[PDB]
Design a protein around this ligand. Structure first.
Ligand SMILES: Cc1cccc(N2CCCNCC2)n1
Lengths: 300, 237
């Protein structure tokens, strides 16, 4: 188990760790988060008590270094940093763990939620979507736009998700115009899976990363990306059986984890009714369909 | 965006544009089978592609052989339309390619858009207008060339005959749509009107009678009456 220590907490903020969050009062004696499970990526995220505008946060993996949060009063935000001096970090953290100034990553043991939402998410791929290569962790917030959103403005602060566009030459082979548009199996399997993503795991990892950035930050283009990658699969007549099975698991937990009060902005009526009821894979997402119909029958 | 009564004059500017209508692409007669079931038998069709500014009509003829062995034909018909429109564009010299194409039915937007991906500078637009181009198979010579066709065929027409020598495209278009609206609401009457006077003939190279200016005015008023009436006869007013 690992630790993300803090210099202090000078402004009042709600801190998120993965699917967990707690309130910290201005200048409360808070020095960080402990017992973080190794083996997973994580996101530690922030909503200031004053300005609910701009959720922000950092994707990180504790195997890739020692990582602390120090509030920056010039830029006004909680900043993730790396401590290269391991000895210094092990000592400072033991100090705070002794004074018991840290909250415990509050994982229940029956609970595989985080793993199920992050199964295929790897830090190395996040860092290619979120280009800032001097840091081993990745900053995301609510207002960051996507590489596809900029075609339609700052490229350094973008989410470089894989561009999916159903009415594009990439997606549509000359001569199979109707065939490839009604049945995107060509686009899914050859263009994307074989060509761009290489395997289903990288594809699923991007899809999962995109949901989580949608959910935790309300990043709108990330939800666009999440719905697009579902739809590509659902609109393809030919999908490896194992991908269909895994996607049903993947989405099932995403829908399970979604805040009930956020479904109206984060869930696209069209894509879901199409996926669950019109598409080739309308019969292939049993767990996803069962939870969607019992939790959100309104949308459908 | 959508074409409607407010941007109506844009049809007649100097940007090349074509209307596409697909309502007559897939045509069936519905009949009873010997066992007492129903089957469709397809008949030849056409795509009605039309430059409203010049009156040039690119009547692509859709021979029933194209539906042989195909499923979901109403859907294929929209992709077949889009295939043919696109081949038409590709065959025109650049300086003749439309800058826009306006489809009279919104279902044609995505099929055409996909087929036109090679022409990103060509806007594919819907319209809010309820235009009557379906009635184009009520024009006898058009109906004729379609029914006689034995293979796919493109036939070129000027749907305005020689009107533009004397009237503007705006006015040509309004006359044409008044004729087609009449043909659509009550074909028998509309046709009786156009040919009542056997001395007013259709030149072999035209589709409509050679009326004088004063005879067109009379005709146009009779088509108007027809349309108002058939609206009363329909809604009892
Ligand atoms: C809370 C934490 C843990 C470990 C190191 C670290 N720091 C901050 C102290 C000043 N800069 C050196 C690095 N900060």
């Amino acid at each position: 188990m690992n630790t993300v220590p803090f210099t202090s907490a000078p402004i009042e903020v709600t801190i998120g760790i993965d699917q967990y969050s707690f309130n910290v009062k201005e200048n409360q004696p808070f020095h960080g988060i402990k017992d973080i499970p190794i083996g997973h990526v994580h996101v530690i995220h922030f909503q200031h008590a004053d300005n609910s505008s701009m959720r922000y946060g950092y994707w990180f993996d504790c195997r890739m270094g020692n990582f602390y949060i120090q509030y920056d009063p010039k830029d006004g935000l909680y900043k993730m940093m790396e401590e290269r001096d391991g000895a210094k970090f092990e000592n400072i953290v033991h100090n705070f763990k002794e004074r018991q100034m840290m909250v415990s990553y509050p994982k229940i043991d029956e609970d595989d939620t985080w793993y199920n939402l992050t199964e295929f998410v790897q830090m190395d791929k996040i860092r290619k979507i979120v280009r800032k290569d001097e840091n081993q962790f990745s900053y995301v917030d609510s207002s960051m736009t996507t590489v596809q959103e900029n075609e339609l403005s700052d490229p350094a602060h973008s989410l470089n998700y894989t561009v999916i566009n159903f009415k594009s030459r990439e997606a549509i082979r000359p001569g199979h115009e109707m065939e490839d548009f009604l049945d995107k199996s060509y686009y899914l399997n050859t263009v994307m899976l074989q060509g761009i993503f290489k395997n289903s795991s990288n594809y699923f990892g991007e899809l999962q990363f995109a949901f989580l950035n949608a959910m935790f930050f309300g990043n709108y283009g990330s939800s666009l990306q999440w719905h697009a990658m579902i739809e590509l699969i659902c609109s393809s007549a030919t999908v490896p059986k194992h991908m269909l099975d895994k996607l049903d698991e993947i989405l099932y937990y995403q829908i399970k984890t979604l805040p009930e009060q956020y479904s109206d902005i984060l869930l696209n009526e069209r894509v879901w009714n199409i996926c669950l009821y019109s598409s080739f894979q309308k019969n292939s997402l049993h767990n996803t369909e069962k939870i969607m119909e019992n939790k959100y029958p309104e949308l459908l | 965006g959508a074409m409607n009564s407010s941007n109506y004059a844009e049809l007649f500017n100097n940007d090349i544009k074509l209307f596409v209508d697909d309502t007559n692409v897939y045509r069936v007669t519905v009949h009873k089978t010997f066992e007492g079931n129903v089957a469709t038998k397809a008949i030849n069709g056409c795509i009605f592609t039309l430059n409203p500014k010049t009156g040039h009509l690119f009547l692509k003829i859709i021979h029933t052989s194209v539906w042989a062995g195909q499923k979901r034909l109403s859907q294929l018909a929209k992709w077949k339309t889009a295939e043919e429109v696109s081949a038409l564009v590709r065959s025109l010299p650049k300086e003749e390619q439309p800058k826009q194409i306006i489809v009279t039915r919104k279902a044609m937007l995505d099929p055409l858009e996909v087929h036109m991906l090679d022409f990103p500078n060509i806007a594919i637009r819907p319209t809010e207008l309820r235009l009557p181009f379906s009635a184009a198979m009520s024009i006898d010579k058009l109906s004729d060339v379609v029914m006689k066709a034995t293979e796919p065929q493109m036939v070129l027409f000027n749907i305005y005959d020689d009107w533009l020598d004397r009237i503007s495209s705006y006015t040509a278009f309004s006359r044409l749509t008044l004729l087609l609206r009449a043909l659509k609401t009550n074909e028998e009457s509309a046709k009786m009107i156009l040919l009542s006077d056997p001395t007013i003939t259709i030149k072999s190279y035209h589709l409509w009678p050679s009326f004088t200016d004063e005879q067109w005015i009379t005709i146009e008023s009779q088509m108007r009456d027809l349309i108002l009436t058939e609206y009363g006869r329909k809604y009892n007013v």
